Design a protein around this nucleic acid. Structure first.
Ligand SMILES: Nc1ncnc2c1ncn2[C@@H]1O[C@H](COP(=O)(O)OP(=O)(O)OP(O)(O)=S)[C@@H](O)[C@H]1O
Ligand SMILES: [Mg+2]
Length: 527
DNA sequence: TTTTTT
């Protein structure tokens, strides 16, 4: 870690409501990841609230989406009625009564209206007038990156809540991401601000040369959902291995089918989820505390719940007597007899709707499980008790004509993994008398080789294809291209400098702030 | 042409 950075953790240590920023690449998130350790040691592991604007970027540091944390849904409604939505769910209310520090990363994507609301929700809950109820704030973004989504949106700082809230500011300088290319850093420093010359243009337009043709799948960054899907399938249908179709149950009672379709998209769920063995996926609904919107991962193989109950126990003891896997692979009546022991009335009218999802293929045969699924065991001639894989594969050949679901290896930003067999979820849009106008049961997955540029903001991409065809917001081009470590590993199609421009309030804001060294002097102000 | 909801 640098010297300019440690003066921030230690500023946040001493308890100051800092916002802190810097060019893309300057290691603000990495910094934050360690800052979060030393704020749980002050308040409590359960009293620090790690969040970001999006949900993938929120996983970059360990956190849930800011909206998921506060418990405000999409947070469109009035500032007063969000308070009563919060104080209903007991979990979310005391989550606001105990947090000592609220962390928000890539706050650039939050709009002044919500920052005003959270500020209010906290004050009326915590019984305190202080700029957020006394909650130590830590805002970490870069206002030259993507601005808050509008459907006019004032920036996070135009709010009364921000300029009341932020007590202190800092500003990092050394761009670490492209550290070995002092030229490429420069090219992005002036793409961030609005200036591009010929040598920049020609160099970027030279990057459209195809990327290396090795066995590492390059990441692709398109500005739209229907590009991201074109590339997520342009790439998936190049993967060796048998596909698995996943058809989404739909309903139920709306008449305008054009909005029905459009409603059926923003659920983040596709009508046709195609998934092979080895696809990069990303959870899209907040399921639990560590499997959330934005969790990258990979698909491992496709098993039904009877099967996966063996494979799960088989991960917890590869030194297991196989006389019990053989009791399940020669009599699968006893198989259910151990699965049930470990596990509403409107949920029983959606189980039997989710029950139909991915109908059983009693006429299609069941291919064997891959090699890599039993690699975990392969780590002394008398200990080769591995009739286990032949037992496990036998248990799989008993699940033809049974719904097989994706077993996904998920990966957190602290580098630990977690396997889960992904069950369908349900997306409904309804009214006061509960009738789902549009309802859809699909898997909470989408291919995650291509992110949007919004979702990729905050990422650090080793080999990244970028296509500036359909960018429409200031700095968005600068995000997609600055997600790159180098130039040797970067493709740039349809480079268009004729719309690469700055916003005026972003120049106006980064002239009234404290530099990296104007963070040190406030340390001897404490001491 | 975008994100956000257990
Ligand atoms: N002190 C450091 N020493 C070595 N590598 C660093 C250091 N700080 C950052 N990096 C590298 O820089 C990248 C991480 O920088 P980030 O923390 O992601 O900054 P940032 O996320 O680009 O800022 P954004 O995009 O505005 S959220 C990784 O490749 C790190 O290995
Ligand atoms: Mg980041």
């Amino acid at each position: 870690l640098s010297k300019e950075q440690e003066s921030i953790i230690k500023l946040a240590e001493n308890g100051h409501n800092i916002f802190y920023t810097g060019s893309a690449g300057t290691g603000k998130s990495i910094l934050l990841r360690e800052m979060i350790k030393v704020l749980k040691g002050i308040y409590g592991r359960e009293n620090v609230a790690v969040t970001a604007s999006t949900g993938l970027a929120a996983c970059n540091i360990g956190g849930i989406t800011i909206h998921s944390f506060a418990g405000i849904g999409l947070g469109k409604g009035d500032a007063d009625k969000l308070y009563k939505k919060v104080r209903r769910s007991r979990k979310h209310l005391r989550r606001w009564e105990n947090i000592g520090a609220l962390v928000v990363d890539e706050i650039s994507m939050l709009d002044a209206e919500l920052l005003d609301k959270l500020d209010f929700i906290a004050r009326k809950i915590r019984k305190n007038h202080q700029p957020f109820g006394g909650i130590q704030l830590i805002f970490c973004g870069d206002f030259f990156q993507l601005p808050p989504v509008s459907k006019p949106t004032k920036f996070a700082f135009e709010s009364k809540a921000w300029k009341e809230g932020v007590k202190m500011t800092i500003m990092l300088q050394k761009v670490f991401r492209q550290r070995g290319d002092v030229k490429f850093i420069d090219m992005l420093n002036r793409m961030r601000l609005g200036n591009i010359d010929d040598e920049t243009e020609r160099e970027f337009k030279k990057l459209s040369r195809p990327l290396p043709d090795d066995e590492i799948i390059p990441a692709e960054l398109y500005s739209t959902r229907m590009e991201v899907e074109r590339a997520n399938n342009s790439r998936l249908s190049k993967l060796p291995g048998q596909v698995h179709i996943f058809n989404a149950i739909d309903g139920g009672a709306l008449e305008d089918e054009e909005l029905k379709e459009r409603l059926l998209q923003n659920f983040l769920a596709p009508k046709e989820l195609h998934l092979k063995v080895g696809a990069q996926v990303m959870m899209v609904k907040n399921l639990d505390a560590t499997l959330v919107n934005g969790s990258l991962g990979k698909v491992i193989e496709f098993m039904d719940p009877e099967t996966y109950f063996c494979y799960e126990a088989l991960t917890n003891d590869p030194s297991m007597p196989p006389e019990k896997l053989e009791t399940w692979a020669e009599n699968p009546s006893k198989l259910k007899a151990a699965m049930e022991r470990e596990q509403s009335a409107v949920a029983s009218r959606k189980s039997s709707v989710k029950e139909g999802f991915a109908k059983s293929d009693i006429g299609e045969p069941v291919s064997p499980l891959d090699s890599s699924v039993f690699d975990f065991m392969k780590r002394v001639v008398l200990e080769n008790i591995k009739r286990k894989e032949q037992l496990m594969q036998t248990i799989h050949q008993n699940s033809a004509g049974k719904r097989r679901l994706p077993l996904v290896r998920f990966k957190a930003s602290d580098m630990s993994t977690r396997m889960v067999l992904v069950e369908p979820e349900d997306w409904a849009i309804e009214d006061e008398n509960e009738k789902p106008l549009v309802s859809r049961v699909q898997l909470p997955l989408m291919l995650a080789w291509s992110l949007s540029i919004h979702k990729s903001q905050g990422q650090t991409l080793p080999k990244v294809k970028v296509d500036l065809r359909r960018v429409f917001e200031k700095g968005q081009a600068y995000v997609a291209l600055s997600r790159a470590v180098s130039r040797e590993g970067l493709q740039v199609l349809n480079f268009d400098r004729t719309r690469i421009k700055a916003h005026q309030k972003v120049i106006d804001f980064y002239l009234t702030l404290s530099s990296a060294e104007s963070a040190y002097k406030q340390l001897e102000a404490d001491e």
